[PDB]
């Protein structure tokens, strides 16, 4: 059935799928997904599929084949090696026009892979859908990479530092670059808002863990916290300007600096480490 | 006569043509004012069906003042109609109307039995009567000017729900804390209409074991009035539940629980002379495992034990024997605090003699 | 048979079983033997307590097995 | 310092047509002046009593900053010549807590006493203000 | 006084002669208050003899030495060091003969409390460990029902607070604390007699946590974490609870029933619904296993038959289905009560009539003493109703007609 659906629907994504290819496209994606749901529980099938999918994702994209083809990209590539989120999130930084530098620029749209940028790159369809998609896979990597917070250990410390630095570099592209095509006055605002507060909360639990047992974790935490300051610590500031009734003055995402304080408060314990000095402020 | 009227109303009341049937039903429900005959017969096919859809609702609009000062049996019947006929969402407000009109709660237990038949076939038929009795108390009755049927219905609705009990406990202690209808009428219910509250005896007991390890002042002091008022005039089979609550529940209970148990058994062995017989052994069994008492807590134990054991003639035997035996048991040789417990017990027993061969027993205690 | 009734005494004390014995036939045979009275005993029959009306067949009982034969004074 | 500034927070939170706007203006202006002197003198005390100011003032910069802004948005043009006045006594003290005061990060493991919640109250007053003018004009 | 010889004679040479607990009675107090090796100490923390004697018989030397030490206060690493040393011959070898476990250690906890936790591990170590790998298993059963009698004679402390300290922390408290196969045995047992609803709530949190950690842990940490979230203990404690019934000791095997009214009693219908299902499957296992009380537990589904005024769909339905199919049925041992569920239950739910009928018919219908006792009721009870009570007439008419095999023959309506 992967033969049937892939052959036909990719035939459409190659040649068909004009103005006359929407429902054919949508049913293409939803089929491919809900058959993938047991499509390759083992590695031969599952990896053949995810390879066939990224192979597709080198090609162009459209306003409904953004959201669903992305969702299927998420299910496959995020159960396939579940830290693929950071991997996928690395691909999510391209020329998508948003506050890249000197204020306006395109520091990151969706194109760190630059051919994934084919799919989530081309224009405001790429910007809007991949702003939403980075936001969602962000919350995913968060609630699960903030799930190794209880599980103490040494495996959990290795895993947290790895996945955390991945999610942080993700947010580094997704803030030094342009979130809502820069602005996107609902969903780009919101990605910045929630993903910022979540990033601060998760960073709080790891700093909090040091408070419980703190004998020698200063090396790995030093990598982690210096990275956190230079990447996701300064740029939330320049965000606070390059993103800031009549139009509903509901910028409730603004008092997610009290999460910037939660990171500082725990950092302020500083027991045997001048972390504000090994980091930035 | 209405025997023939209500007779043929019974049979047509479910099985009738339904096209002129519902119209003729509304015809009699237009005739249903002048008598209280057609109230019950309508209310059967106005329990089965609706002769009109708001024909039902208008007829139930008849139902509110339809029984303001009704008789005994017309109470259960017109209540079955006045609540469960068509209980809509806004029929919850319907409940409130009845709670204002005919709920002055008064053979008499048969009157309670009919009140219960209506109220409790509806208490677990349609759930809205749960919200109905909730709004009957919590809105404006479970605070200001409480009916004794408020406490009774709380026994039925506010305590006797399957899963509509958690907030049933919230409003159950809600005005139960602010003195919204406090336990000074709890004596009136738990005295005058007993098995009308007693069939919910597990509910009285849920009020005891949860609102009696309580920490508000007069809620606790009214909940201890329950286990007081319950284990006195109730039935003598759950009285093992009273005197195994005021005994073992004051065994491993607390500083608060031990105070409640001492005061429970104290209110028993003071306020009840006779009833301290049947459960004597249970408190005797709580008279052993004594790892919590000061000379007023352990002395409270021995104050109760001797409060009964030196009180009856033919019945003091196994108690008093076990008493002298326990005193000589611990306070004969030794235990880490044991001699303190013993000397306290011995003195307390002498207070038992402090009221006679008990001077010989005091010889035995010095012995 | 002789159930190895190793109660709070400290050995593995013995008996002579009654497949229709007393509900405390072991209790009488030990309350004479050990000394503590046959109403102030309590024997852990495999994990449950002995049912002092029915005899030790009701336990699914054995021979040589170990009752947990302890006892405390309620009067004391 | 603590006993006073706590009293001042309590009294400010106590006070809540165009006569109403004139009243609220007067009472808030009195209050804003009281707090003005309080912060200034808080440039006179030391480390045990900066904390009292941090705490009472986080309570205050969010005391009217959601608890009196009900009025200062409604008389935002018709009263309108005190809106700059109350706003300016704000902006003075608000410079005190942020642009000077929260220097525990310069307290020091005793300045969680206001550091997260205080930075929250400051961003909150700023935002509720730029929506307390744009929602008037 | 007289127990100095435990250094060089009693625990050294020519010792293990019994009655010298009286010889301990010169001053059974050498090992809450303890530690006289020359100097009221920690239970196993202490001088020359009373510290270093604990290689063999430090606090108690015999089982009578054990209970005599308890009579003398002198418990910590002594009972535990022996419990590693003697387990199933020398500590609790029987319940009674060898059972200084079942008698001695439950002597020692008599007369601090967190030491009992190690005793559970001292119970758990090979005991129920070797079950994973006069009766070896029966020695299991005697030690288990004894240790449960021991916990119970304790409760009759609030170790459950430390139990909650054993409940959840850092993966030490977090996943392993209910993971005792008789750990849950003791939890349910101790909670049995009274003041246990916090322990129920603890196990409800344990099932919510097993649901949670597994649901997430399908994907959230596979290469990162290892398997068994919360130990993976949902079916773990389920197979363990069949084991408590399997030994046949009724310590809490018939206490394990009220862990099902705290399964379906707050049932909805992942996490918040698979727990009603855990409770239901537990009720089914303990209806098929604990065969004596089955008419007392399947007479307990009648509670969710009474309160099913729109309440009991999945619980009553799948419950009465499984137990009624498994049991021959009360066989009129249910029939004394269970007749008028039709307009009693359907008068709440139209899923009531169909479900209750399609359950109680393969027992009460083919019984035929209450088959004409039930489908008599509906053809009366579906005379005149609302659309909710016309539906019950339709339903039971269909249920009788479909379930009485027809055709001549011994037919449904021919014989």
Curated annotation (Swiss-Prot), chain C:
Function, as annotated: Exists either covalently attached to another protein, or free (unanchored). When covalently bound, it is conjugated to target proteins via an isopeptide bond either as a monomer (monoubiquitin), a polymer linked via different Lys residues of the ubiquitin (polyubiquitin chains) or a linear polymer linked via the initiator Met of the ubiquitin (linear polyubiquitin chains).
Phenotypic consequence of residue 42 to E: Impairs ubiquitination by CRL2(KLHDC3) E3 ligase complex. Impairs ubiquitination by CRL2(KLHDC3) E3 ligase complex
Result, substituting residue 76 to A: Loss of ADP-ribosylation. Impairs ubiquitination by CRL2(KLHDC3) E3 ligase complex. No effect on ubiquitination by CRL2(KLHDC10) E3 ligase complex
Full-length numbering of the shown residues: 1 to 76 of 685
Crosslink feature (Glycyl lysine isopeptide (Gly-Lys) (interchain with K-? in acceptor proteins)) location: 76
Post-translational modification: Phosphorylated at Ser-65 by PINK1 during mitophagy. Phosphorylated ubiquitin specifically binds and activates parkin (PRKN), triggering mitophagy. Phosphorylation does not affect E1-mediated E2 charging of ubiquitin but affects discharging of E2 enzymes to form polyubiquitin chains. It also affects deubiquitination by deubiquitinase enzymes such as USP30.
Consequence of substituting residue 74 to K: No effect on ADP-ribosylation
Protein name: Ubiquitin
Domain Ubiquitin-like: 1-76
Positions of the record's site feature: Interacts with activating enzyme: 54, 72
Swiss-Prot record, chain E:
Membrane-spanning residues: none
Record keyword NAD present: no
Placement of covalent cross-link Glycyl lysine isopeptide (Lys-Gly) (interchain with G-Cter in ubiquitin): 380
Protein name: Fanconi anemia group I protein
Signal peptide positions on this chain: none
The organism's place on the tree of life at top rank: Eukaryota
Gene Ontology biological-process entries: DNA repair
Quaternary structure (record): Homodimer. Part of a FANCI-FANCD2 heterodimeric complex that binds and scans dsDNA for DNA damage. Interacts with FANCL. Interacts with MTMR15/FAN1. Interacts with POLN. Interacts with UBL5; the interaction promotes FANCI homodimerization.
First and last residues shown, out of full length: 107 to 574 of 1338
Family from the record: Belongs to the Fanconi anemia group I protein family.
Function description: Plays an essential role in the repair of DNA double-strand breaks by homologous recombination and in the repair of interstrand DNA cross-links (ICLs) by promoting FANCD2 monoubiquitination by FANCL and participating in recruitment to DNA repair sites. The FANCI-FANCD2 complex binds and scans double-stranded DNA (dsDNA) for DNA damage; this complex stalls at DNA junctions between double-stranded DNA and single-stranded DNA. Participates in S phase and G2 phase checkpoint activation upon DNA damage.
Keywords: Isopeptide bond, Phosphoprotein, Ubl conjugation
GO CC annotations on file: nucleoplasm
Residues bearing PTM Phosphothreonine: 408
Modification after translation (UniProt): Monoubiquitinated by FANCL during S phase and upon genotoxic stress. Deubiquitinated by USP1 as cells enter G2/M, or once DNA repair is completed. Monoubiquitination requires the FANCA-FANCB-FANCC-FANCE-FANCF-FANCG-FANCM complex. Ubiquitination is required for binding to chromatin, DNA repair, and normal cell cycle progression. Monoubiquitination is stimulated by DNA-binding.
